[PDB]
Amino acid sequence: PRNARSKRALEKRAPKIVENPKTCLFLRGTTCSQITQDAMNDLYAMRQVHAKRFHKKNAIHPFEDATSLCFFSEKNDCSLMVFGSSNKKRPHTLTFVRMFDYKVLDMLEFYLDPDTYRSISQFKTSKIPIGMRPMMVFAGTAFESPVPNAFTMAKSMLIDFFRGEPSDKIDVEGLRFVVVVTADEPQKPILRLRVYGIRTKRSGTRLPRVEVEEHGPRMDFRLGRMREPDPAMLKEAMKKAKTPQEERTKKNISMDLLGDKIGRIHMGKTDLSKLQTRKMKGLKR
Amino acid sequence: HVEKYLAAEAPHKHLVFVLNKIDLVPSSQAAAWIRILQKDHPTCAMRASITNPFGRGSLIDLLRQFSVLHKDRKQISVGLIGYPNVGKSSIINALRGKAVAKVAPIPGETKVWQYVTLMKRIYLIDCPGIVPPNQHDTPEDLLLRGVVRVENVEHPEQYIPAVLRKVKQHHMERTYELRGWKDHIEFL
Amino acid sequence: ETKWQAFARRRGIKPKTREQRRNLQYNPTTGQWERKWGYKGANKRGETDPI
Amino acid sequence: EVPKAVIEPNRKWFTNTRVISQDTLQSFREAMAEKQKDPYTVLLKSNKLPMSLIRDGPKLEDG
Amino acid sequence: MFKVVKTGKKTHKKGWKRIVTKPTFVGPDFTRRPVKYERFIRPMGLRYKKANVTHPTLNVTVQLP
RNA sequence: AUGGCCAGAAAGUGGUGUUGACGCAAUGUGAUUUCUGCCCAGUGCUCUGAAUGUCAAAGUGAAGAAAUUCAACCAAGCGCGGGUAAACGGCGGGAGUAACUAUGACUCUCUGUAGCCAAAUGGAUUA
RNA sequence: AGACCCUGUUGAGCUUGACUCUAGUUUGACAUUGUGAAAAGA
RNA sequence: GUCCUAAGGGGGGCUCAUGGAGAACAGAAAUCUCCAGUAGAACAAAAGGGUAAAAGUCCCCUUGAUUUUGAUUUUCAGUGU
RNA sequence: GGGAUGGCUUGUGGCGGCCAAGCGUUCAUAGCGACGUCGCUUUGAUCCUUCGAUGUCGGCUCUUCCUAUCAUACCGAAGCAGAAUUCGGUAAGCGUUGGAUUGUUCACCCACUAAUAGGGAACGUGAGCUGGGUUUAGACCGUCGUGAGACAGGUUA
Numbered sequence A: 001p002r003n004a005r006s007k008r009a010l011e012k013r014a015p016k017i018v019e020n021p022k023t024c025l026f027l028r029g030t031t032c033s034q035i036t037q038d039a040m041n042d043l044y045a046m047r048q049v050h051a052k053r054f055h056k057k058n059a060i061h062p063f064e065d066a067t068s069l070c071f072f073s074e075k076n077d078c079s080l081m082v083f084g085s086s087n088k089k090r091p092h093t094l095t096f097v098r099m100f101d102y103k104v105l106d107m108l109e110f111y112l113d114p115d116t117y118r119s120i121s122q123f124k125t126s127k128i129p130i131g132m133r134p135m136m137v138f139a140g141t142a143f144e145s146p147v148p149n150a151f152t153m154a155k156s157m158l159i160d161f162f163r164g165e166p167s168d169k170i171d172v173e174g175l176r177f178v179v180v181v182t183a184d185e186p187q188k189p190i191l192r193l194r195v196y197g198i199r200t201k202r203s204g205t206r207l208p209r210v211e212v213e214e215h216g217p218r219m220d221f222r223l224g225r226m227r228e229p230d231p232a233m234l235k236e237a238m239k240k241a242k243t244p245q246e247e248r249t250k251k252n253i254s255m256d257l258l259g260d261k262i263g264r265i266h267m268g269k270t271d272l273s274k275l276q277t278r279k280m281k282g283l284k285r
Numbered sequence B: 001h002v003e004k005y006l007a008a009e010a011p012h013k014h015l016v017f018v019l020n021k022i023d024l025v026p027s028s029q030a031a032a033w034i035r036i037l038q039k040d041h042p043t044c045a046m047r048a049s050i051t052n053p054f055g056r057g058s059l060i061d062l063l064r065q066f067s068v069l070h071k072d073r074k075q076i077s078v079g080l081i082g083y084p085n086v087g088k089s090s091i092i093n094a095l096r097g098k099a100v101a102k103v104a105p106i107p108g109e110t111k112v113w114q115y116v117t118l119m120k121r122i123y124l125i126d127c128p129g130i131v132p133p134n135q136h137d138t139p140e141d142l143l144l145r146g147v148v149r150v151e152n153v154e155h156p157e158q159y160i161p162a163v164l165r166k167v168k169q170h171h172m173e174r175t176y177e178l179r180g181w182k183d184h185i186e187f188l
Numbered sequence C: 001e002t003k004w005q006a007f008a009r010r011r012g013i014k015p016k017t018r019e020q021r022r023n024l025q026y027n028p029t030t031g032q033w034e035r036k037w038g039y040k041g042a043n044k045r046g047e048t049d050p051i
Numbered sequence D: 001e002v003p004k005a006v007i008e009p010n011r012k013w014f015t016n017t018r019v020i021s022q023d024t025l026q027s028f029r030e031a032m033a034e035k036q037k038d039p040y041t042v043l044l045k046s047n048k049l050p051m052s053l054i055r056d057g058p059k060l061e062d063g
Numbered sequence E: 001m002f003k004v005v006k007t008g009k010k011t012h013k014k015g016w017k018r019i020v021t022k023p024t025f026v027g028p029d030f031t032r033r034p035v036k037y038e039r040f041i042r043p044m045g046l047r048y049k050k051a052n053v054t055h056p057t058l059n060v061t062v063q064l065p
Numbered sequence F: 001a002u003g004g005c006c007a008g009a010a011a012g013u014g015g016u017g018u019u020g021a022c023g024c025a026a027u028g029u030g031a032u033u034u035c036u037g038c039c040c041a042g043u044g045c046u047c048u049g050a051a052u053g054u055c056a057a058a059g060u061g062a063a064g065a066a067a068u069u070c071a072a073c074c075a076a077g078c079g080c081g082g083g084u085a086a087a088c089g090g091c092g093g094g095a096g097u098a099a100c101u102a103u104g105a106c107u108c109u110c111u112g113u114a115g116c117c118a119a120a121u122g123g124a125u126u127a
Numbered sequence G: 001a002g003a004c005c006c007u008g009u010u011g012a013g014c015u016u017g018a019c020u021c022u023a024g025u026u027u028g029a030c031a032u033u034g035u036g037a038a039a040a041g042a
Numbered sequence H: 001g002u003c004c005u006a007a008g009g010g011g012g013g014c015u016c017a018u019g020g021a022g023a024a025c026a027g028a029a030a031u032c033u034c035c036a037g038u039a040g041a042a043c044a045a046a047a048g049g050g051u052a053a054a055a056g057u058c059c060c061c062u063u064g065a066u067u068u069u070g071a072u073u074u075u076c077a078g079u080g081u
Numbered sequence I: 001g002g003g004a005u006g007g008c009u010u011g012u013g014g015c016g017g018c019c020a021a022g023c024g025u026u027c028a029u030a031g032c033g034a035c036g037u038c039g040c041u042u043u044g045a046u047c048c049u050u051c052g053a054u055g056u057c058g059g060c061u062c063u064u065c066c067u068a069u070c071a072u073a074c075c076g077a078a079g080c081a082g083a084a085u086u087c088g089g090u091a092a093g094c095g096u097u098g099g100a101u102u103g104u105u106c107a108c109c110c111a112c113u114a115a116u117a118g119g120g121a122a123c124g125u126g127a128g129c130u131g132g133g134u135u136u137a138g139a140c141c142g143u144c145g146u147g148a149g150a151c152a153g154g155u156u157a
Ligand SMILES: Nc1nc2c(ncn2[C@@H]2O[C@H](COP(=O)(O)OP(=O)(O)OP(=O)(O)O)[C@@H](O)[C@H]2O)c(=O)[nH]1
Pocket: A278, B020, B021, B022, B023, B024, B046, B047, B048, B049, B083, B084, B085, B086, B087, B088, B089, B090, B091, B102, B103, B104, B105, B106, B107, B108, B109, B110, B111, B127, B128, B129, F125
């Protein structure tokens, strides 16, 4: 990296303690239907700021070989991928791919219902501002399986998708849109994705009365094939790093409210019962 | 005087009271005085003795806690201050388990400072006794506190009434097997 | 650890301070502040002198 | 040997080394008001603070 | 800057201790080194904490820590 | 006792030894009274407990016409793995657990104006 | 012509995992070293 | 063997390689003009989709060559502001 | 085997700013600047803040010198009534003392007195007598070191 700009790019791509927000690459296979492309466009519109788009046709079957997916992730620094596909067996498929260290961590297929699908443009409402993260609601009994399953991985993937940029503070004017995923434990269960805008009304109390209006897109999914993580790779990915601004707690050492370092001492209970006083001549009767 | 200097100028130094010669008082009175002094500073009860000490393990534990709190430094230094003849050198000897500092009932036995290695990271510094100057302290008060040698004072009979006031009469009668005096001159 | 880093850890060689490693020094003959290395550095002294 | 004692020109000589905001000052003033004395705690490292801007003023009779 | 402080009871004295002859500033929470490992002696009577500082623009001299 | 501790250049040499554990030899401390801060296990002390890991000379095998070279095998000690005089040394405590054995690691929180109890005394403030 | 201080291709006593050795001690091998058995390998 | 108010950063303007058609010397190749030009140039890397009112290239400003603070992270500290 | 700063010093702070008679300059109006002044360094208080020995001083016994005068003599001034003084001048002729305290920079307290002045002649190395800095060899205690030993040191002969 002789160039300072290339050095900056390398430092941006370098591993960090506090990671960058994840980037999602949107790409399609050699055959991909118009409904699948519309679904991909709606997801990209929800995630514009941290996404890149491919426009060519890629001869990739991810559950057979993902070498090209790993190459694309390493080239574009994208750790989330949305892959569109179509077939006779699978007419409308979105494959969510999550990667770790430019290798496939896990993969999940979503089968889209074409008849119930509605785009964002099919609702005449004011839409979400660009870059605004929405609130999230996950509903139903399908997301509390004791063993990790397709619905648990789908919840994790959708959280990583609609996560946005983390922040310690949020404006109260930035709570106007909610994304609701509903799925019930059971012939296959249906994972339903809906987006709503939020209106508040006076209710006579301090808390306002919430009302919702549909925003789009309307999506019905059936969970399909699954690629589970290796346990060692999963442990590596689920490790959490401590920031330097997280103090390692020392015994008996603390900080007071003025910033002074304070140490605590422990005297113990005074037990003078085992002390014999001096048998003085003036006390000996 | 020294407490005010320590509070004003060196608040980072840790002041610890040590009540010595607790074998000369009733234990209930020693506990009451400990409860009074611990409102201001942490207080350790101690009988200073090489052979038969009291409070030695507790004081060692407190110094160990201070050493752990200052584990970044190479050591902690613990300076012993107080009045003459209160038992500073005796406390150093009791903590060491060996006669390392000179001990006498003569006030002013220790004249210069002395470094004693208690453990690898703990030093003890013996100091001569100090008498903070007060305009309300009388020579009789200093003599009864033990500041001076009584061999070098003129007219020692004048301080006997203060001793007779301080000591209960039956205690003196039992000490000297003597009774029936009406004043200090006839007692002497 | 590099070879220098392992050697410095073995020999107790401390890292230099940021004031110590500054690219600046006082030349008394000219009475001026000059860089030790780099452009017009002191390591290339005399290469542009007239004589 | 007699060294050359020279200070170099530097923009760092003409800046503010330590700054503090009004919110931090107010937090420290509230802590100063609420602080209490504990015999079983010791001070190990003082915080470098502008204590003249944090400490409460003297009594009006004294002033 | 430094003067040699001599130690030992013999006629030939050890000379490793150096006393600073100029005023010094030791900073807050200062505790002196133990005497066996104290090479540089900064004596108590030469330690300063305040300075008379003049502001050139305001033409005001204040005593500052 | 086919021993310990010594001596001699060696000796079919001498001593301890006309000796045998209530003895001999080497240490440290130093009458009596007082007296063994609490707990370990890093250095050390010692365990023939399994290994060949290191592994000399001699011996064994292979090649070569031979000089020679290459291989295994390989005592004690070291190393590895156990118990300590626990001497030096280190060592703020007390609960827990998910580790499960060493090293744990991660939370919690700690402040009688002359008595009682001990085989008269409570001492070293020792004649 | 002491004592003190300074210098040495300095002398000497003393200490220690300083260097090279070494008494003592310990371990292996060859020789002194003979006569019969039983077992396992050539 | 030479030359440079260094590189870097921010902002702004502009568009390249090449081909065709034209302009005294000038003729395959010197400079100017128009048109066409997905980058086929340049600069980075080693794309299987790097960058075009720019990441290219020229102007303006900074060039101060490794700032200050931290009770926090890791390591060290017989000289622990 | 060598070796063992000085016609100095004294009574009035430093830093920053301002003013300033004057010096310079007057094709540049800058630069020096005495005398001053201004800012940083408890309503007679508090007595609950004493801030580091590498550097050594002593005492008798006795003589002389200086004056930078404490007392004695004379003189000038002050609300100096008197008395007692205070400030200053000439003056070294004549005196300037016992005593306490070594847990200690032995410096301060007490008294008498007319008064209890300050220095030099050593301390710009240095054989009168005799105590402390002080230190050959004996010995403990503390600190450091595996040790021989050394020292932050303390004690004894
Ligand atoms: N009875 C009793 N006597 C004690 C105790 N501690 C000390 N003493 C006595 O008090 C006297 C004073 O002892 P030191 O050690 O010299 O005390 P100090 O304060 O250091 O005395 P200085 O050195 O003169 O300042 C000694 O004679 C001890 O016997 C105690 O705990 N009990």
